[PDB]
């Protein structure tokens, strides 16, 4: 043939094969979003997907199988849970009137299914919860897996944090790097805004405004946070659907631990024995990540009412997983 | 307040204002495929979307902005045309039982109100026209638009060519970039592939099998391209669309305009007096990409029956245009 | 000819030329890891160098030119400065028993043949000083050429700031860009490094040890910035040469400019105003950097007995400065 | 402390380690271009640097480890050879009135010393040997380290097919990679400038110019391939060193290798029994590059006299070998 004709193998021994291997399990919008943010930016040297609608995936996986020109990496996608095999980092991102109970019970049922094979090809893996809830999930993934607690992490409150300094940047004109801000606790409605820690340049601005955050407040920062977790309801009120910050949100997670740069994130861990937590539960907190996963913690000093915020929810948190059948 | 108890403006004169900008017209998912991956691969300083669509329009542009953090473009979109103003480059990408004439008008009536706004605020832009048909809707552009030949770009073959680098490469066990073969005239079913010019490191491929893509082929060179052609509805006869490919293709040819690379892309362009073409219309041929937009064309040395096929397709092209109301 | 044969040129008017060149004045270390960082980066479509140089600037010129396959600038380089015309950023970087103040002199007397050669060919580019001493000679730079204050910038505290953050990631085990410290005012022994902003995730270390930088410091804080600033001294008595890490800087530096990031950056600029500066002299203090140049400057508040230490600088500073012939 | 205060480390076993580590060995200029051109693409996610003079390796690491905030890799350096241990890639770019014998020996002295060390913190790293001579020395390397043949690669033609191609590129306003065009045998003054595969876009460039190489050539092609040769004397007889071009072609071989591209790169490799080859000698022909080292190899379709001149070469570089103390 014409392949024998032009090239002949001189490699005795078999290839080593992938070593940056990421698998995205889900192929909605925000699976997607993942997957091509960790493409366009040479993350790694494989991505594979998978989801249990397998026309759905192979459409999608074919599709950028078709731009493999202007990419760097392998592209795999199949229903088959072999397929993630040697995988470094999974990323988790499939989804869900009734009870919070309840359609949390329904993604825990959906995560029986997919956490076991994902272990049983990915026994070193380290598992990145995406799907919401977050921080129940996370857990659910970390019990439901058997991993050593350092290999299960959850993005907790990453985006949020990150349109939070962005926001910011808008309101100030600067660039959103410039902004430092951090959003902990439990994601969505209850998380903690660290008036404390709101900077530019290390000048604090709760500094410049005494009554940052409260009813005081002459300038209103406290509906910056609420515009931040209103977020994804907003623009899924407009467009039908959230993917682009999740997606950028979660190639910036996955470039920190395959890189091995030990950056602090704000993600989701558990937290049991920080600020008054007693409970089993996952919470963000600023966390150190490498490619040995997330193997540091940090203690923000928060004052009393923002260690109680997250105390209450731990207990909100625990109702609903000890209801849980796992 | 707060910002001016931390920031001085100390610059006298107005701001220079952005000087990359680049406008994708339309928020399907080629439109947001182009946008995502411009952005991830920070090529412009401003990226503007645009669409009839408002609320999906802002629902994107959102969810874009939202994270701005993990980028270096400055994100707008409005359905007012005021907010492409000073774009360096326009790409458009809105489209369409039913004849093909008739199909064609409508996409036609379509490029007769953006076209107009375009032109008006982005007196020097340049257009890369992407909605299907490409060829004769590069041509309405141009002709429709007033602009100097070689500001105005169809995306032509450019994905297509990628493609079949990519199947190239998957039957050669070699990456795309390594793999060199072209496809050109009237994209898809009567496009042409170049078998003369199919090489890896200058090796001729058809030079090793004579008879690569007629009907004397041991191996069927013919059906990779046809493959190529049947690419975009294999993957929507899956996941009901197409994007990730275009997307990326779009990109590719926008840092070419950008950087103002002098790279040679299979675009779709102006071919009158090129290979025996006797009327005014576009097909791709491979041309020279800069800043100042598409300065060069490359006369490939065509055999007869390719060179015929070029011809035909123009009198195809031509059968539709005459008919057309601009 | 060949060429001729192959390609035809099909643009009529002519081309719109460069739009992100930069230009390096000074082929010693310091201009090639500033030039060769840009190109790495993709930061401008046009890098040009120059230098007195002349056998030496071809040599680089020459070298660069030759990896231009994997790069996307056109490189430029000659003596005549006619090959810097056009450029939107100008880093400089041409440098020098001998008293500072004669050290100095001869340093301006280089400039006075530099500046204007510049502001011929470039008459609206961005000056970024790098040489040093840098806060008097962006200065030098600065009424040397008419400017307006924003168009002229110098590289002041960044590397140290970023040398830093790099030791304060080595002791703690966090990358650099976790760690958030800034070092201010004159370059060099007498720069501030301001420990109240010390920190890593908005928690602030000064707030866990509340001695930092103190003789009461059971932590000798204060010795790791005297490490940042026997920085240069400590590289140069091993390797005879400084540049790997000031030629990032620049780079860094640059992109927040080219890609109009409105990005907070430490460097040297017109202090006049403030913290009880009286003089007309430059120093660093956090500044936003655009496509503009540096349009904003950030009020740190600083304690009593640091605008003390800025106070005193700008007096030794303007005490050299109506000493030189300008 | 404050590091205590401020993080709990909440993983129990042993962090992996480093997975994408590079070594390169020497820090003479060709060596840091090496590790500046690696450093600021993010091709790994740890650096070392080794050479015998301790001091001026403990300057150019130190320079670079100042820099971390840019990067996004960790850097070491030591005379200890320890300090390379668990490299994927190791770059080695140590070396040399009198003969080309001698002067060989010398540089064999030299690996001698080396590889041992290099081979036993790294058993089962890919070596790539960038010294000149390289295809002799690659062959020592070889040898002298007992590794199967696909992981000891030489750089061969590699950067002086990327300085034909940015050359052609100048002759005809094209970038560089638009340019396609193949150097291969021994690199230098011998080597073989393939006139069939100089392509522009699947174009056959002697197909326009038939005479192309020779001396009917009205356009003196062959001259550029001698200007190619005359690369690194002419620079060097300019700015005193080589380097820069170098450093980024060796970025470029390293990429392929550790993402796992399977490109094709023009090196040097075991050619014995291609061609009509017959002794076991190392040559540039094209190669396919991953992650597992240089795993096929190209059998372009050379005219006899092509051919032809690859004996010849083989023959006077098993002349030298033959003389060699191993």
């Not at 944090?161 to 926001?167: D, P, Q």
């Not at 902990?184 to 000048?203: C, F, T």
Request: charged share 20%; proline share 3%.
């Amino acid at each position: 043939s014409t392949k024998e004709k032009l090239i002949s193998h001189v490699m005795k021994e078999e290839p080593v094969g992938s070593r940056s291997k990421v698998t995205v399990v889900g192929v909605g919008m925000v699976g997607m979003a993942s997957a091509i943010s960790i493409l366009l930016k040479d993350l790694c040297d494989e991505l594979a997907m998978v989801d249990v609608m397998e026309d759905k995936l192979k459409g999608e996986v074919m599709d950028l199988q078709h731009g493999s020109l202007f990419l760097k990496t392998k592209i795999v996608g199949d229903k088959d849970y072999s397929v993630t095999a040697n995988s470094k980092v999974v990323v988790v991102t499939a989804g869900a009137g009734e009870s919070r109970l309840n359609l949390v019970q329904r993604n825990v049922n959906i995560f029986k299914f997919i956490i076991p094979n994902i272990v049983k090809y990915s026994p070193n893996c380290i598992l990145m919860v995406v799907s919401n809830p977050v921080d129940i999930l996370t857990y659910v993934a970390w019990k439901l897996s058997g991993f050593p607690r350092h290999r299960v992490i959850g993005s907790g409150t990453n985006l949020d944090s990150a349109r939070f300094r962005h926001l910011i940047g808008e309101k100030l004109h600067l660039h959103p790097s410039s902004c430092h801000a951090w959003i902990v606790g439990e994601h969505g409605d209850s998380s903690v805004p660290v008036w404390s820690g709101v900077n530019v340049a290390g000048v604090s601005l709760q500094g410049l405004n005494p009554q940052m955050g409260t009813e005081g407040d002459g300038e209103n920062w406290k509906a910056i946070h609420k515009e931040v977790v209103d977020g994804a309801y907003e623009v899924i009120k407009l467009k039908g659907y959230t993917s682009w910050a999740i997606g950028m949100s979660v190639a910036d997670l996955v470039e920190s631990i395959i890189k091995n740069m030990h950056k602090v994130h704000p993600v989701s861990t558990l937290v049991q024995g920080m600020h008054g937590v007693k409970d089993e539960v996952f919470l963000s907190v600023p966390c150190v990540l490498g490619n040995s996963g997330l193997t540091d913690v940090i203690h923000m000093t928060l004052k009393a009412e923002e260690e109680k915020q997250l105390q209450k929810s731990a207990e909100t948190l625990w109702g609903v997983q000890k209801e849980l059948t796992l």
